[PDB]
Amino acid sequence: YDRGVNTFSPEGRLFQVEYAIEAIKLGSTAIGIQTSEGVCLAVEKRITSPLMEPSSIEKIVEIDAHIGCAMSGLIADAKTLIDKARVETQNHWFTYNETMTVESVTQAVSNLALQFGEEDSRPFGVALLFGGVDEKGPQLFHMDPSGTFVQCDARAIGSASEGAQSSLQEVYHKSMTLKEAIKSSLIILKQVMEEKLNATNIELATVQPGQNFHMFTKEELEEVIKDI
Amino acid sequence: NQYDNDVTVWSPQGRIHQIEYAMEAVKQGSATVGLKSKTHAVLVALKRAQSELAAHQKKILHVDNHIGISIAGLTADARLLCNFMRQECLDSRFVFDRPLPVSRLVSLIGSKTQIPTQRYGRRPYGVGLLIAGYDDMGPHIFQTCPSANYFDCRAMSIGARSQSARTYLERHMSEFMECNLNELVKHGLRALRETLPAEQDLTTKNVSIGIVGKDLEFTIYDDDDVSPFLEGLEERPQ
Amino acid sequence: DRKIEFSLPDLEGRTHIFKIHARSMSVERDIRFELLARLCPNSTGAEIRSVCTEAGMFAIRARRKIATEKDFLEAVNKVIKSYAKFSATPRYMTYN
Amino acid sequence: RFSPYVFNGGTILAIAGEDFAIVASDTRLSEGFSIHTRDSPKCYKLTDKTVIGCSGFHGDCLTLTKIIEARLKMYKHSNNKAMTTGAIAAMLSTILYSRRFFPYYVYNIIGGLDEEGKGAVYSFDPVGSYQRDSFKAGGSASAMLQPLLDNQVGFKNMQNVEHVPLSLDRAMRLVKDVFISAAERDVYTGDALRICIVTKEGIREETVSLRKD
Amino acid sequence: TGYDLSASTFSPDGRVFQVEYAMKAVENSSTAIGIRCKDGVVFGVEKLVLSKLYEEGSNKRLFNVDRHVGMAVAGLLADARSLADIAREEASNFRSNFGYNIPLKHLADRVAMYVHAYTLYSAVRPFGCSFMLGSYSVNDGAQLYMIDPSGVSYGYWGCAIGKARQAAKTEIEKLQMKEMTCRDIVKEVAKIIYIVHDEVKDKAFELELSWVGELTNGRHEIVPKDIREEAEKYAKESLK
Amino acid sequence: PLLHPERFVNLGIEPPKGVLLFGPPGTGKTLCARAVANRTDACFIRVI
Amino acid sequence: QIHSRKMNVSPDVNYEELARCTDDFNGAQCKAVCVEAGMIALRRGATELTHEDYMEGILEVQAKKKANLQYYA
Amino acid sequence: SYDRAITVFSPDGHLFQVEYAQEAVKKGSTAVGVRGRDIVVLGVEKKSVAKLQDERTVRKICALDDNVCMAFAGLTADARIVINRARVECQSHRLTVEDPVTVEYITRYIASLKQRYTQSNGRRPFGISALIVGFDFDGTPRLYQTDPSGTYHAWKANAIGRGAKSVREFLEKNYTDEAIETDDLTIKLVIKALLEVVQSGGKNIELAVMRRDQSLKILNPEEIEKYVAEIEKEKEENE
Numbered sequence A: 001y002d003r004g005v006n007t008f009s010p011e012g013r014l015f016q017v018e019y020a021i022e023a024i025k026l027g028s029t030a031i032g033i034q035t036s037e038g039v040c041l042a043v044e045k046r047i048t049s050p051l052m053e054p055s056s057i058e059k060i061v062e063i064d065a066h067i068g069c070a071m072s073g074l075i076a077d078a079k080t081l082i083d084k085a086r087v088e089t090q091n092h093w094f095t096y097n098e099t100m101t102v103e104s105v106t107q108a109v110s111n112l113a114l115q116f117g118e119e120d121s122r123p124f125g126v127a128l129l130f131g132g133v134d135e136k137g138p139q140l141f142h143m144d145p146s147g148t149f150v151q152c153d154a155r156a157i158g159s160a161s162e163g164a165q166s167s168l169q170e171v172y173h174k175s176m177t178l179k180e181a182i183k184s185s186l187i188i189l190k191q192v193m194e195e196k197l198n199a200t201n202i203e204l205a206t207v208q209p210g211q212n213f214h215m216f217t218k219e220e221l222e223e224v225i226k227d228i
Numbered sequence B: 001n002q003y004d005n006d007v008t009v010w011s012p013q014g015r016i017h018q019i020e021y022a023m024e025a026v027k028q029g030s031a032t033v034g035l036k037s038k039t040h041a042v043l044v045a046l047k048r049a050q051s052e053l054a055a056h057q058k059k060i061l062h063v064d065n066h067i068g069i070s071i072a073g074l075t076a077d078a079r080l081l082c083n084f085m086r087q088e089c090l091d092s093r094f095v096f097d098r099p100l101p102v103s104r105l106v107s108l109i110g111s112k113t114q115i116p117t118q119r120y121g122r123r124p125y126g127v128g129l130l131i132a133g134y135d136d137m138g139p140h141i142f143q144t145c146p147s148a149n150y151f152d153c154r155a156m157s158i159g160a161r162s163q164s165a166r167t168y169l170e171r172h173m174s175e176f177m178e179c180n181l182n183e184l185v186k187h188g189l190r191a192l193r194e195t196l197p198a199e200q201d202l203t204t205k206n207v208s209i210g211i212v213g214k215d216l217e218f219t220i221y222d223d224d225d226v227s228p229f230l231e232g233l234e235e236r237p238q
Numbered sequence C: 001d002r003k004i005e006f007s008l009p010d011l012e013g014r015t016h017i018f019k020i021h022a023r024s025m026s027v028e029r030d031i032r033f034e035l036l037a038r039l040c041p042n043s044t045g046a047e048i049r050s051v052c053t054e055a056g057m058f059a060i061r062a063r064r065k066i067a068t069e070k071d072f073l074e075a076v077n078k079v080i081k082s083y084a085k086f087s088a089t090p091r092y093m094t095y096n
Numbered sequence D: 001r002f003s004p005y006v007f008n009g010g011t012i013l014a015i016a017g018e019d020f021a022i023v024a025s026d027t028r029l030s031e032g033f034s035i036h037t038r039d040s041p042k043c044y045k046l047t048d049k050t051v052i053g054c055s056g057f058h059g060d061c062l063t064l065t066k067i068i069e070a071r072l073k074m075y076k077h078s079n080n081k082a083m084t085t086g087a088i089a090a091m092l093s094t095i096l097y098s099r100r101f102f103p104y105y106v107y108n109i110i111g112g113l114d115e116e117g118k119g120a121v122y123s124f125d126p127v128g129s130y131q132r133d134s135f136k137a138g139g140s141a142s143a144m145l146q147p148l149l150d151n152q153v154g155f156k157n158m159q160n161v162e163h164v165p166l167s168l169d170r171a172m173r174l175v176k177d178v179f180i181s182a183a184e185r186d187v188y189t190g191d192a193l194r195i196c197i198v199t200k201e202g203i204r205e206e207t208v209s210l211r212k213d
Numbered sequence E: 001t002g003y004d005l006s007a008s009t010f011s012p013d014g015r016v017f018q019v020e021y022a023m024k025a026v027e028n029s030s031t032a033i034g035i036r037c038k039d040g041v042v043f044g045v046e047k048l049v050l051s052k053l054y055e056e057g058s059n060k061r062l063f064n065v066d067r068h069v070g071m072a073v074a075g076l077l078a079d080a081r082s083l084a085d086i087a088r089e090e091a092s093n094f095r096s097n098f099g100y101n102i103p104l105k106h107l108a109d110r111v112a113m114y115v116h117a118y119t120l121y122s123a124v125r126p127f128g129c130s131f132m133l134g135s136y137s138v139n140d141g142a143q144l145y146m147i148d149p150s151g152v153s154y155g156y157w158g159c160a161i162g163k164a165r166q167a168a169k170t171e172i173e174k175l176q177m178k179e180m181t182c183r184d185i186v187k188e189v190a191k192i193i194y195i196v197h198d199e200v201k202d203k204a205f206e207l208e209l210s211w212v213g214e215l216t217n218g219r220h221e222i223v224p225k226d227i228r229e230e231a232e233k234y235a236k237e238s239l240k
Numbered sequence F: 001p002l003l004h005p006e007r008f009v010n011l012g013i014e015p016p017k018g019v020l021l022f023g024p025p026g027t028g029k030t031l032c033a034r035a036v037a038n039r040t041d042a043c044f045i046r047v048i
Numbered sequence G: 001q002i003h004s005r006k007m008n009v010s011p012d013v014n015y016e017e018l019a020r021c022t023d024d025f026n027g028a029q030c031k032a033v034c035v036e037a038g039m040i041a042l043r044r045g046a047t048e049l050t051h052e053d054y055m056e057g058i059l060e061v062q063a064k065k066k067a068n069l070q071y072y073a
Numbered sequence H: 001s002y003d004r005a006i007t008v009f010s011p012d013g014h015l016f017q018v019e020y021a022q023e024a025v026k027k028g029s030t031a032v033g034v035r036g037r038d039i040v041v042l043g044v045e046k047k048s049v050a051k052l053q054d055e056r057t058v059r060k061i062c063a064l065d066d067n068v069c070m071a072f073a074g075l076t077a078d079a080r081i082v083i084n085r086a087r088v089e090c091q092s093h094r095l096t097v098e099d100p101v102t103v104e105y106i107t108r109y110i111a112s113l114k115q116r117y118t119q120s121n122g123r124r125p126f127g128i129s130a131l132i133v134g135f136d137f138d139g140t141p142r143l144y145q146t147d148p149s150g151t152y153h154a155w156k157a158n159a160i161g162r163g164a165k166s167v168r169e170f171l172e173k174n175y176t177d178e179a180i181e182t183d184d185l186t187i188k189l190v191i192k193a194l195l196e197v198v199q200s201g202g203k204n205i206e207l208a209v210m211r212r213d214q215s216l217k218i219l220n221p222e223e224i225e226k227y228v229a230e231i232e233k234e235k236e237e238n239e
Ligand SMILES: Nc1ncnc2c1ncn2[C@@H]1O[C@H](COP(=O)(O)OP(=O)(O)OP(=O)(O)O)[C@@H](O)[C@H]1O
Pocket: C017, C020, C044, C045, C046, C047, C049, F024, F025, F026, F027, F028, F029, F030, F031
């Protein structure tokens, strides 16, 4: 009874979506931290080849001009979720002349991830981190293949997910600043990855209230790493 | 064990096991308690944390100005029934220009959940809805089940270890019809504290209380306004 | 009367197991073990000890008397990755 | 043969204040050369900060009002907040264009407060184009009210007169004077005057009688 | 047995066990009896209280299909609710197409053919319900029908559905039902319920009595035996 | 029960007398049997 | 109820409520629930039993355990 | 154990039927491709004519539009559907939007058409991998690649087919950060890369270049024989 999305267990449960949570584990790590000054975000690349072009590997995509994103797990299912998440923020501005809030973005995203066998296919294999600054300030959210949606203050997913969480709960507090949280985030990264941390293994993305631009760092990232 | 695969297949004992397994998904969720007086119906739920610093998952959600529901079970079947619930509430406002009677809205749910418990191709809805409402004849407390049966009741507790909450409600149900909201709410949340392990306490960050009244619209209080309700309580006799 | 079953240690179990089977061997005094417990997802206590014995065997392939970090990293590929996966490692580009 | 449209009359007035908004209308419902009732106001309290007025064909006014009130609830449970004044005018433009080839015979004016606490008046057409104005007058007596408010509010065609902003009390007597002069020359206007005042403290109402002929 | 999975397959001796399995699921439900006098039909349902929090009139098994037609279901209660809505919908189309009340002989045929259709395909299962149909008219008198999960539907003078199907009809047939009035029937139905296992190995119960005939002028409604309480006063005297 | 045979009787329970160990191989079945032979202070019988 | 004669049972326990959740057991597994529930209360040093103490003793017979399964809110 | 379905997961989170489609790519002839300063180049190996057939119907290199090329692997049947479909999209894009089609746009169409073709049961996925090379998007040379899972991706030098691991390891020690100007030098890099063929017969190489302004220029087995001669001229310095 463990090969069907249309079949329960004697105890609970699935037994199909539980296997979809396991598909996240073989991804790459990603850390996002919510701070009152804004939301920073970090990820690991895992570049395989030197001939492999680096900017064709995306981990941070721009959903909107005040909302970033992060992903892990299956790359093939991720590009489907990013597509409508750009469209649903665009349909909302067309009919309301306003920016869709960061919480209500994922409401539209979770409404299709819970449609895998509930029409009249398989569940997805990708967890997502959504950071953005809406009218309620900076926000940071998190979802899963099971459509379970929640708000987090600082979250780390992918591979090395549980090992990051124990060290990440140690140093977080409410009165952080943005420039403190950036250098606090990649102390965790060089302790959980196996290669030496340089300017080519990672990439950053921030968002601020008055600086809704710049969900990327372009070789100012070299300044942060050299002062670790 | 070969009969334990589909909803269509009957058993040689006459019991379909797939409906019997969807009851077990209700026991995975946390406990929640609903009750009512002559004038006021209050349902109280219990939040559960995911991690040490994520937000707690919400349980009570607004539906209409005279209807609010609780939840226990799958979150996939939760919002799928909510979107069916909200669509039927505004159709009577658009057509009949009256609010729905609460007793006949739940009969639409039992017709809704009956088809995926008979036809192949869709599992039953793993869900534990508690319903409070106001028709023209006072408050109501309803529960549903994944076997598509709906039970009218005056007090009910479902979820994890909710049997100990039922024992508190049976020996205090004679007191519920007369008392008002200053103790009727804290008659209810004295029943949640037996569904807890005996070392931690019901704090302000893990509980939600929703009140709909005869002259009061359905209102959800959480995490800031629970403090006028948690005042004036005794501890557990330890 | 009692059905005690044994399962695989999640992460905190394995990080304690590496500190058991590698405390009595000449290693570098600055390495971390939590990175090693990542790379053994579905492994047993026997497989963890086989990694600890194999990493010292690479030190005798070279001429050393202490174990480095890359001694263990090659030992994980020798024990697990030489038998657990061969299609997912080169043709990996579905997951990053 | 069957014709689907008829004219019912009505007159709607809105003035955007500095920190307020005033919406006024008559309560006369007529058709042809008959009076259906003398008590049918055109004001509709959408939210606590937004009042809409609907003139024209009365069957479409009852339909379009109930569609907007449904979508207010559909916005809220999807977003955990209420709509703004400018969000309703953006939503209404898509609803009016959605029946482009069978149009609503309704003239619409939305008045209310913005997110800064100032007045805002949006005027409409039966197909769905809009703009933000300071004062508009829609309905059957629309031509009899726009030139006078250009003199008093807009200070047009005046010489050696300072531009003092309109106070609340001065704006009340300007509304009470234009409907007396309009009910004399127009036949689709009279029998009452419902006035709604939208401020930061709620919505007030006031009724002034007119001539009953 | 293995050759008993689908409802569209035959056994090597020639019967469908999926229909046979659903029949004895009705057997585990509590007893509901039906009886008709010379000028009416009287229903009666033994219904047990679940624990204590039941609110005295919930989830009843005495439905109301038409102006003069009601049901006396037993078995899976949720499956009977969906089946009752079919009979409500079927009687409405007969009104809209013919302009008068549905005859009970024609109504039971339309329902039993609908129950029959769920016993043929492998996609759906047979129902797990059995029920009663009682009505009264001035051109047809009183009738009483009976529908199994297989779809066989024909008329009785008295019946029982539940555990005590045989144990109730033993003492139904010792009544002179051809000439009694349906006010004297009501005090006689209540003793048939209370003889056979009302709360002996069970916990508690509550009696429901539905009612249709000449005294109601064709209407179908519950008894006024909350008024004067005479059913329990007359049946509890049969202790010895 | 071999070191405190009191709290079982002084509450009114009885200890179980048979324990099976099951699971994947190489998980530590023999270790738990090998370690209780160290700290037993009692008769212990391996059975081939 | 027979094998629970010799222990401190708090008198809010219905054995009919236990027969709701216990199914397809023989007589010896019913004895095994009664033995294991006495030791679960011994873990936290409880002095009497409860209905929750039996429910964990039920899952121990077929050797089950429960987590936070993150589907169930 | 459990695969036999494209919708089921493994207990450790895998799609084996998707992973088995990449195993069918390794039965194909190798094809390499690099980008340069102005001239992009791609070559294929393993012609192996069989003495009795016409060789103009066994072509592995086709053009989708006027300034984009194509090289593939896998099995020949599934490539013909993807090629014929991509010619329609790179022509219907020009009708709806009057620009020429960029090299990035056509690779997202091939990947997304292979994406939804993997999700539904009873639809066997394409067992091909493709190389899209085009210096079309405003004078900029680019080359991408595909995958049977449906992941379009960009390299700077690529190898596929039966023996891609040796060639991709060869080019990492050979592709200089010094950009290969004097584009016959860049063509000689491919012939040196294709010199590590499965048999290296010399006359089994079909190199096709593009000077980013003209059309496709299929090389003849007399100009390519001249480039094979100068590769042996540089090999004389070993003694
Ligand atoms: N939890 C653990 N902690 C430390 N070492 C362990 C653990 N589990 C296994 N080992 C190591 O693995 C080796 C083999 O384990 P062992 O043979 O006892 O497993 P087993 O389950 O008894 O095998 P089998 O099931 O085949 O009898 C032991 O020598 C021990 O050093």
